[PDB]
Amino acid sequence: DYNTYTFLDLNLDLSKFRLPQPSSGRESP
Amino acid sequence: ITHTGQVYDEKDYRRVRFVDRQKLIAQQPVNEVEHRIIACDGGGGALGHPKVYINLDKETKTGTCGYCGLQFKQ
Amino acid sequence: SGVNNTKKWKMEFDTRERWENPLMGWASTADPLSNMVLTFSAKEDAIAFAEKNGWSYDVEEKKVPKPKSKSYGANFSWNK
Amino acid sequence: VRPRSDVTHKQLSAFGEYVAEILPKYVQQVQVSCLDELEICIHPDGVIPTLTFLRDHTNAQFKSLADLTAVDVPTRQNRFEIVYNLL
Amino acid sequence: PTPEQYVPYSTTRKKIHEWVPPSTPY
Amino acid sequence: FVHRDTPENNPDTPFDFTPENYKRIEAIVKNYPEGHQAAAVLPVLDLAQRQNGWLPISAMNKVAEVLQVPPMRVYEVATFYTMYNRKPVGKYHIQVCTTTPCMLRDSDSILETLQRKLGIKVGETTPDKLFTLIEVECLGACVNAPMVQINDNYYEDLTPKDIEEIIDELKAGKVPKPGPRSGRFCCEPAGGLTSLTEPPKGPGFGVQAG
Amino acid sequence: SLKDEDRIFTNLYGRHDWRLKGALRRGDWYKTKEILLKGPDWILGEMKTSGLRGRGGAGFPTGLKWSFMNKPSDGRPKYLVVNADEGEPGTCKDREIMRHDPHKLVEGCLVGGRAMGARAAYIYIRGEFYNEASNLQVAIREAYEAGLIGKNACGSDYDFDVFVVRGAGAYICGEETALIESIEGKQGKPRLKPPFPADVGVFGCPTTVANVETVAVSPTICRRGGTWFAGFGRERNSGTKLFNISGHVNHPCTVEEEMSVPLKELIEKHAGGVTGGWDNLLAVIPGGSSTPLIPKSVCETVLMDFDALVQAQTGLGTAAVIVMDRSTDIVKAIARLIEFYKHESCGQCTPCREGVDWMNKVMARFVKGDARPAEIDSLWEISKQIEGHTICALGDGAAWPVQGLIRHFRPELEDRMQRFAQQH
Amino acid sequence: SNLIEVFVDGQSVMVEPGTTVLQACEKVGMQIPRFCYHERLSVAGNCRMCLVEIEKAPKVVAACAMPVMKGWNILTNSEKSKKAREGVMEFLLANHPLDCPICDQGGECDLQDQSMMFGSDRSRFLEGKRAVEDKNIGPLVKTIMTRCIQCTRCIRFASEIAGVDDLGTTGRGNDMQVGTYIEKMFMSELSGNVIDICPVGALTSKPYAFTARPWETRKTESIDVMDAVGSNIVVSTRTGEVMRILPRMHEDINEEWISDKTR
Amino acid sequence: PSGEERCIACKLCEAICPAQAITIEAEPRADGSRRTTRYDIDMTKCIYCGFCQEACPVDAIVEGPNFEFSTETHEELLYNKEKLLNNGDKWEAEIAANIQADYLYR
Ligand SMILES: Cc1cc2nc3c(=O)[nH]c(=O)nc-3n(C[C@H](O)[C@H](O)[C@H](O)COP(=O)(O)O)c2cc1C
Ligand code: SF4
Ligand code: SF4
Ligand code: SF4
Ligand code: SF4
Ligand code: SF4
Ligand code: FES
Ligand code: FES
Incomplete structure (x- = not known):
C-alpha cells in the first residue's frame, strides 16, 4: 500500500527525531 | 620483397650476395557462431593449437584466436 | 615476486662489444669472459676470487627490503 | 618412489663408523646419503693412508678405482674437491 | 601416393636509425 | 558488465534530482554518520532508480557527483547489486x-x-x-x-x-x-x-x- | 511443548495491530526504563543465563557475542547493526517479525544498545522487501513520537537513534563483515575476520551484528528473565525459535514452536503432514539451502536443535525446513542451489569464485547424466577444497549441499550416470 | 619487549607485535606462496593461495592476513597446507586461458612457477572455460584480461601507490572483470608499474609486446637519467639492443617503481 | 591449411635447442598477431636431436623426412625463415602424413 517514495519521505520526516551524527573528523576517507 | 619486406638495398654491402644466385588469413572468411564464446582447436585437436575459448561477445569485434588469426563473427 | 634468485652473490665481468654479423645478422662477441658469471655464497669469498685472479672488483652492498608494517585492520580505518 | 632397501642404509652406515674409528686421524665427516652411498671425507694428508686401508683391509677390500674427479666450488677456499669413487 | 642457390640473409630491418643531416644548408 | 556509449544511454542523457528528489537525497546523508556521505551511495543510487528505471551512465555520474565519491565507486555499487537496473x-x-x-x-x-x-x-x-x-x-x-x-x-x-x-x-x-x-x-x-x-x-x- | 502463555513472539500471523497501540496492548515496552536502569551488566547476565543462542545462520552464544563489544569505548562510538536481510532461501522467518510485530524489534534495538553502548542501530532490511520496511519505518517514527526512542529514551538518560538501510538484492550482503561494507557504501564483499567486528566494524567503529530474531527476543527475555528462556531447551540449544516449513507438506507455515522438538512433531503437530504421507520424504533440508539435507531414515530419529543436528552432520542454521517428496529430482533440486550460489557469491575469493562455478557446471551435467560415475567423488574433492579455503562462510555453505547429495544419494546419481550411457 | 615469540616449524622467530603469519615466515627464512599480496600494497586476501596451518588449529589461516599470535607454529610444509595449495591452484588454472606461448609473461609468471612448485601435476576441469572482452586501457598497457586472476593488485596500486582511483571491480560471480567500467584510458605517470605488478600476463606492455622472452634477456643494473630522482632500473638487453627497462628496488630512491617516461 | 604460418614465436624451440642453433627475434605483425621476423636454424650447428619437434606447442617446427640436402657452400646450410617455410611447403603433404601416423604415440 506504498508508493515508491514512501520510505525516503518517511525517513526525511524521521529527521525531526535525531541527534546530530558524529564524525571521523576528516574531509573524506 | 619478403614477409617483413627484407630489402638488402642498392647501396647495401650485402646485396652483393644474390649476384648470380636468386633470393592469407585476411582471405579467411569470418566463422559465424551462435554462442557467446567459442573454442578454436585450430582444427584437428591434437594436430592443432592449445585450445582457447574466444569471446565473440561484441559484434563490434570479431574475436581472433591469437594462434590462427581466424576472425569469428558472433 | 619470488626471492630465490636474490640470495647468492654473483660477480660478473664488464660487458664488451656485440657487433651484428653481416651474413646472418646474429649477434657476435669478441670478449671471452662475457657470458661467465661465477656464483659465490658470501661477499668475503667473492672478493678473494678477484684478488688472487687479479681482476679489479667494485663490490655493491646487498640491499634487502626494509621491514614493512602491514595489518588488514589498518586500511579499514575511515579516519585514515 | 625408488625401492630403498634399509638393509643397506644400515650396513653402510655401520661401516662408516668402522672407518671413522679405524682412522680417527684423517676422517673429518662420514655420511651415508639417502641414495644409499657412503662418502667418507678425509683431510688431504689422509689421501695415501685412507685409500691404502680400503685397498688392503680384510673387512673392507676396495680393489678398483672407479674414478678420480675434482668438482670446483669457486666460493670454497679450497677450490677443488677431489673425489675418489672406489668399488 | 596414387643460380638457384639459396643465398642466406637477415630478414629483420634496420633497427637503429641515424639522424639525417638537414639538407637545408645553414 | 561493460558500458558503451549509445545515444540512448550516455552521459549526454540528462539526469538531475528533482528539486523534491534532491531534498530526499540529503535526508539520506544525515541518516548516515556525520562526515560520512559515501555510505549513502546505495540509498541515493536507489532514488536515481526511483526517478528513472534506466539509470544510465549519466545518472551514476551524477550520483557520484552529488555524493562526491570516485565515480567508479558508484559504478561498482550499481554493477554488484541486481536491484539497480543499468538498462531500461x-x-x-x-x-x-x-x-x-x-x-x-x-x-x-x-x-x-x-x-x-x-x-x-x-x-x-x-x-x-x-x-x-x-x-x-x-x-x-x-x-x-x-x-x-x-x-x-x-x-x-x-x-x-x-x-x-x-x-x-x-x-x-x-x-x-x-x-x-x-x-x-x-x-x-x-x-x-x-x-x-x-x-x-x-x-x-x-x-x-x- | 510450548504454551501461548510462554511465547516470545506473540503477534505472529498478524490478526493484531502491528502499531504501537496494539503492541502496547500486547505488552511491549514494559518498564523499559527500569531495564536500562538495571544496567548493561544486568542485561548480559540475563542473556547469558538465558542461554539464548544466535538465531542467525550460525548460533553463537548471544551473551558472549554482545559481551565482546562491552569493553570500554576507545573514543569511537560503538554501534548496533541488525541484519533484516532474509537472504537464506526457504526462510521467511524474520520477515514476519518486522511486518507484524515491529515494535518488539524497536525495543529490542534499544535494549540491544544499552547492552553495548551503541549510540545508534542500523537495520538492513533487504531492498527486495520495500513494503516491509515502510511498515517498520512507520513504527519507528511512532516510537520516537512516544519518546520510546530518541534522546532520553523512555526518560532513561540513554540516547538511541535507530535507522533502516536499503539492501540491494544480495544474499552475501547478509554476511556479517559484508553487511557492514554495504552500510559503509562500498561493494558488498565480506572483509576478513581477524580484525573482528567488535574491534572494528561499521564505519570503523566498534560494531556488532545480530539476526533480527536475536535482537527481538532479548527484551522479552530481559523482562521475563533468563531462567524462563533457559528452561524451554536443553543445554546450549535452549530457547524459543520460529521454525519454517516450506515444501511438500500439507500446510506451509512459520510455527514459532519451542526448540529441540522432534522433526516429526514439528511437521506433525503443525505443518499438517508431509504431503503424500510421511513415507513420501526423499529428504529434509533442516536449516535452509546452506545446511546439508538429511534423508528420511535419519530424520525422525533426529530433532531440530543445533547440537543434535551437528551430531547428524547438518546445521540448524535459519531452521528453514525444506522438504522433498519422492517426486523430486534432487540432483536438479541441489543443482539449482548451486545455481543459486553462482549467481550470488561476490567472487572476492578464488576458491568460491571458480569452485562454485565448477560445481555448477558438473552438477548440470550430473542432472543430465552426461558425466561418468568417477566424476561424482571428484566433486567430493572439489567440495572440501572450497569448504575450508573460503574467506567467508558462503563457500562453506555451497560445499555442504553437494556433500549431502553424494553422502546419502550416491546410488541415484550413479543411475542417472548409467541412464544416459545406455541410450548413447 | 614487543617481541612475540612464535615458532615457524620450531624456529621460534621472535617477531614484533602485529607481524602477519607471512612476515614471520619471511623472517625465519621461508616464503609462503602468494598471489594477491605485495609488500607496498594493502593486504586483500583475494587469492587465499597462502593458506597455512598454524599448529593445533582447526582451519588453515591466511598468511598475509592473520597477525601471528604468541605460541603459534606456522607449519608451512604440512600435509594440509599443501592440499590447501594443490586445491587453490586447481581453481586459478581452471578458468585460465592456456596461451602461455602468447603470454609474454612466459618465464615471468608467478602463476606457472607457483603451479610447478605448489600446484598439481594434472587438471580435472573437464568443463568449459570463460572469456572476457579485451578493452583499451591506453597505449602502453595491453590488457589481454581473460588472463586476470582477480587478485586486485592493480585496483590497489591504481589507488594506493598512484592516486588514479579508476580501475575497479565490476560485477560478482565468475564474471567479475577488473576493468574500467566505461572505456577511459588509464592515463597517469606510474602507469606502467601495473604491468610489473600484475603477476599474470593479463595486462602487459604493448611496445614490448612480443620482442623477446625473459630467459634470453641479459640484465644489467643501471641508473635512471630521464628524471633527477635517479631511480634505480634494470636494462634488459638481448643480443645487444635494449629490449625493456623495468624497476629494480632501491628503498630510498625508487622502491620498486619507475616513471612512464623512463621505461 | 588456411595459409597462416603456424609459428607464434613463443621461442621455447630456441630455449630447448641443445646446440643454440635456432635464432628467433619477433615483433607484432601489423595484424596485431605475434610472428617471427627472423627464424634462423643453423643446420651445421644443429645435431638433429628432434627436441624442437617435441617442444613446439603449435608444432610449427617439424623434423621433415628429407635427409638429402647436401650443399656445395657452407652458407647454403644456414637456413632463414624463407628457406624453412619453402621447405615446409614442399614437404607439407608427407610431413602431414608422418605427423598423422605418429601423433597418437606422442
Ligand atoms: C553468505 C552468507 C549470507 C548470510 N545471510 C544472512 C542473513 O540473511 N541474515 C542473517 O541474520 N545472517 C546471515 N548470515 C550470517 C551473518 O553473517 C552472521 O553470522 C549472523 O547474522 C549473526 O547473527 P546472530 O549472532 O544473531 O546469530 C550470512 C552469512 C553468510 C556467509
Ligand atoms: S566465499 Fe569468497 S567469494 Fe564466496 S562470498 Fe565469501 S568471499 Fe565472496
Ligand atoms: S599468465 Fe600467461 S604465462 Fe602465466 S600462465 Fe597464464 S598464460 Fe601461461
Ligand atoms: S589485472 Fe593483473 S592485477 Fe589487476 S587483477 Fe587481474 S590479475 Fe590482479
Ligand atoms: S616454432 Fe613452435 S616453438 Fe619455435 S617458436 Fe614458432 S611456435 Fe614456438
Ligand atoms: S634439432 Fe631442433 S632442437 Fe635439436 S638441435 Fe637441431 S634445432 Fe636445436
Ligand atoms: S521465496 Fe523462498 S525460494 Fe522463492
Ligand atoms: S596472499 Fe594470502 S590471500 Fe592472497
Whole structure:
C-alpha cells in the first residue's frame, strides 16, 4: 500500500527525531 | 620483397650476395557462431593449437584466436 | 615476486662489444669472459676470487627490503 | 618412489663408523646419503693412508678405482674437491 | 601416393636509425 | 558488465534530482554518520532508480557527483547489486522466484503462465514496455512459495490462474491485490492455525520480578 | 511443548495491530526504563543465563557475542547493526517479525544498545522487501513520537537513534563483515575476520551484528528473565525459535514452536503432514539451502536443535525446513542451489569464485547424466577444497549441499550416470 | 619487549607485535606462496593461495592476513597446507586461458612457477572455460584480461601507490572483470608499474609486446637519467639492443617503481 | 591449411635447442598477431636431436623426412625463415602424413 517514495519521505520526516551524527573528523576517507 | 619486406638495398654491402644466385588469413572468411564464446582447436585437436575459448561477445569485434588469426563473427 | 634468485652473490665481468654479423645478422662477441658469471655464497669469498685472479672488483652492498608494517585492520580505518 | 632397501642404509652406515674409528686421524665427516652411498671425507694428508686401508683391509677390500674427479666450488677456499669413487 | 642457390640473409630491418643531416644548408 | 556509449544511454542523457528528489537525497546523508556521505551511495543510487528505471551512465555520474565519491565507486555499487537496473526495464519488471522453495510448488509453471500471457520468454521485455520478465532467486516469503514480486508488490501463494489474472489487472487497469491470494492467513497454516489461540497475554504477565 | 502463555513472539500471523497501540496492548515496552536502569551488566547476565543462542545462520552464544563489544569505548562510538536481510532461501522467518510485530524489534534495538553502548542501530532490511520496511519505518517514527526512542529514551538518560538501510538484492550482503561494507557504501564483499567486528566494524567503529530474531527476543527475555528462556531447551540449544516449513507438506507455515522438538512433531503437530504421507520424504533440508539435507531414515530419529543436528552432520542454521517428496529430482533440486550460489557469491575469493562455478557446471551435467560415475567423488574433492579455503562462510555453505547429495544419494546419481550411457 | 615469540616449524622467530603469519615466515627464512599480496600494497586476501596451518588449529589461516599470535607454529610444509595449495591452484588454472606461448609473461609468471612448485601435476576441469572482452586501457598497457586472476593488485596500486582511483571491480560471480567500467584510458605517470605488478600476463606492455622472452634477456643494473630522482632500473638487453627497462628496488630512491617516461 | 604460418614465436624451440642453433627475434605483425621476423636454424650447428619437434606447442617446427640436402657452400646450410617455410611447403603433404601416423604415440 506504498508508493515508491514512501520510505525516503518517511525517513526525511524521521529527521525531526535525531541527534546530530558524529564524525571521523576528516574531509573524506 | 619478403614477409617483413627484407630489402638488402642498392647501396647495401650485402646485396652483393644474390649476384648470380636468386633470393592469407585476411582471405579467411569470418566463422559465424551462435554462442557467446567459442573454442578454436585450430582444427584437428591434437594436430592443432592449445585450445582457447574466444569471446565473440561484441559484434563490434570479431574475436581472433591469437594462434590462427581466424576472425569469428558472433 | 619470488626471492630465490636474490640470495647468492654473483660477480660478473664488464660487458664488451656485440657487433651484428653481416651474413646472418646474429649477434657476435669478441670478449671471452662475457657470458661467465661465477656464483659465490658470501661477499668475503667473492672478493678473494678477484684478488688472487687479479681482476679489479667494485663490490655493491646487498640491499634487502626494509621491514614493512602491514595489518588488514589498518586500511579499514575511515579516519585514515 | 625408488625401492630403498634399509638393509643397506644400515650396513653402510655401520661401516662408516668402522672407518671413522679405524682412522680417527684423517676422517673429518662420514655420511651415508639417502641414495644409499657412503662418502667418507678425509683431510688431504689422509689421501695415501685412507685409500691404502680400503685397498688392503680384510673387512673392507676396495680393489678398483672407479674414478678420480675434482668438482670446483669457486666460493670454497679450497677450490677443488677431489673425489675418489672406489668399488 | 596414387643460380638457384639459396643465398642466406637477415630478414629483420634496420633497427637503429641515424639522424639525417638537414639538407637545408645553414 | 561493460558500458558503451549509445545515444540512448550516455552521459549526454540528462539526469538531475528533482528539486523534491534532491531534498530526499540529503535526508539520506544525515541518516548516515556525520562526515560520512559515501555510505549513502546505495540509498541515493536507489532514488536515481526511483526517478528513472534506466539509470544510465549519466545518472551514476551524477550520483557520484552529488555524493562526491570516485565515480567508479558508484559504478561498482550499481554493477554488484541486481536491484539497480543499468538498462531500461518495462513498467512492471515481473520477477519470478525460481529457486528451491519456489521450484517446489512449481514456480516454473507460474513462469510458463507468465511467459505465455506476456507472449514473451523469461529475460525478455514485451514491446508494450509494461512488462519485463526475469527469473530472480529467493525473494524471501517462502512459506508462500508460488510467488512473483512486482515492484515490491510481492504477490504470494499464487496459482497459475491467479498469475494470469494479476497480469490482466496490470495489463489493463488497476493493480491486483497486493499480497497473497489464498485462504491462509498470512503464513498461518493453510487451513487455519493451531497456535497463538490464547488471547495476547497482558502487559506485565509473568514478568520476571524486577 | 510450548504454551501461548510462554511465547516470545506473540503477534505472529498478524490478526493484531502491528502499531504501537496494539503492541502496547500486547505488552511491549514494559518498564523499559527500569531495564536500562538495571544496567548493561544486568542485561548480559540475563542473556547469558538465558542461554539464548544466535538465531542467525550460525548460533553463537548471544551473551558472549554482545559481551565482546562491552569493553570500554576507545573514543569511537560503538554501534548496533541488525541484519533484516532474509537472504537464506526457504526462510521467511524474520520477515514476519518486522511486518507484524515491529515494535518488539524497536525495543529490542534499544535494549540491544544499552547492552553495548551503541549510540545508534542500523537495520538492513533487504531492498527486495520495500513494503516491509515502510511498515517498520512507520513504527519507528511512532516510537520516537512516544519518546520510546530518541534522546532520553523512555526518560532513561540513554540516547538511541535507530535507522533502516536499503539492501540491494544480495544474499552475501547478509554476511556479517559484508553487511557492514554495504552500510559503509562500498561493494558488498565480506572483509576478513581477524580484525573482528567488535574491534572494528561499521564505519570503523566498534560494531556488532545480530539476526533480527536475536535482537527481538532479548527484551522479552530481559523482562521475563533468563531462567524462563533457559528452561524451554536443553543445554546450549535452549530457547524459543520460529521454525519454517516450506515444501511438500500439507500446510506451509512459520510455527514459532519451542526448540529441540522432534522433526516429526514439528511437521506433525503443525505443518499438517508431509504431503503424500510421511513415507513420501526423499529428504529434509533442516536449516535452509546452506545446511546439508538429511534423508528420511535419519530424520525422525533426529530433532531440530543445533547440537543434535551437528551430531547428524547438518546445521540448524535459519531452521528453514525444506522438504522433498519422492517426486523430486534432487540432483536438479541441489543443482539449482548451486545455481543459486553462482549467481550470488561476490567472487572476492578464488576458491568460491571458480569452485562454485565448477560445481555448477558438473552438477548440470550430473542432472543430465552426461558425466561418468568417477566424476561424482571428484566433486567430493572439489567440495572440501572450497569448504575450508573460503574467506567467508558462503563457500562453506555451497560445499555442504553437494556433500549431502553424494553422502546419502550416491546410488541415484550413479543411475542417472548409467541412464544416459545406455541410450548413447 | 614487543617481541612475540612464535615458532615457524620450531624456529621460534621472535617477531614484533602485529607481524602477519607471512612476515614471520619471511623472517625465519621461508616464503609462503602468494598471489594477491605485495609488500607496498594493502593486504586483500583475494587469492587465499597462502593458506597455512598454524599448529593445533582447526582451519588453515591466511598468511598475509592473520597477525601471528604468541605460541603459534606456522607449519608451512604440512600435509594440509599443501592440499590447501594443490586445491587453490586447481581453481586459478581452471578458468585460465592456456596461451602461455602468447603470454609474454612466459618465464615471468608467478602463476606457472607457483603451479610447478605448489600446484598439481594434472587438471580435472573437464568443463568449459570463460572469456572476457579485451578493452583499451591506453597505449602502453595491453590488457589481454581473460588472463586476470582477480587478485586486485592493480585496483590497489591504481589507488594506493598512484592516486588514479579508476580501475575497479565490476560485477560478482565468475564474471567479475577488473576493468574500467566505461572505456577511459588509464592515463597517469606510474602507469606502467601495473604491468610489473600484475603477476599474470593479463595486462602487459604493448611496445614490448612480443620482442623477446625473459630467459634470453641479459640484465644489467643501471641508473635512471630521464628524471633527477635517479631511480634505480634494470636494462634488459638481448643480443645487444635494449629490449625493456623495468624497476629494480632501491628503498630510498625508487622502491620498486619507475616513471612512464623512463621505461 | 588456411595459409597462416603456424609459428607464434613463443621461442621455447630456441630455449630447448641443445646446440643454440635456432635464432628467433619477433615483433607484432601489423595484424596485431605475434610472428617471427627472423627464424634462423643453423643446420651445421644443429645435431638433429628432434627436441624442437617435441617442444613446439603449435608444432610449427617439424623434423621433415628429407635427409638429402647436401650443399656445395657452407652458407647454403644456414637456413632463414624463407628457406624453412619453402621447405615446409614442399614437404607439407608427407610431413602431414608422418605427423598423422605418429601423433597418437606422442
Ligand atoms: C553468505 C552468507 C549470507 C548470510 N545471510 C544472512 C542473513 O540473511 N541474515 C542473517 O541474520 N545472517 C546471515 N548470515 C550470517 C551473518 O553473517 C552472521 O553470522 C549472523 O547474522 C549473526 O547473527 P546472530 O549472532 O544473531 O546469530 C550470512 C552469512 C553468510 C556467509
Ligand atoms: S566465499 Fe569468497 S567469494 Fe564466496 S562470498 Fe565469501 S568471499 Fe565472496
Ligand atoms: S599468465 Fe600467461 S604465462 Fe602465466 S600462465 Fe597464464 S598464460 Fe601461461
Ligand atoms: S589485472 Fe593483473 S592485477 Fe589487476 S587483477 Fe587481474 S590479475 Fe590482479
Ligand atoms: S616454432 Fe613452435 S616453438 Fe619455435 S617458436 Fe614458432 S611456435 Fe614456438
Ligand atoms: S634439432 Fe631442433 S632442437 Fe635439436 S638441435 Fe637441431 S634445432 Fe636445436
Ligand atoms: S525460494 Fe522463492 S521465496 Fe523462498
Ligand atoms: S596472499 Fe594470502 S590471500 Fe592472497
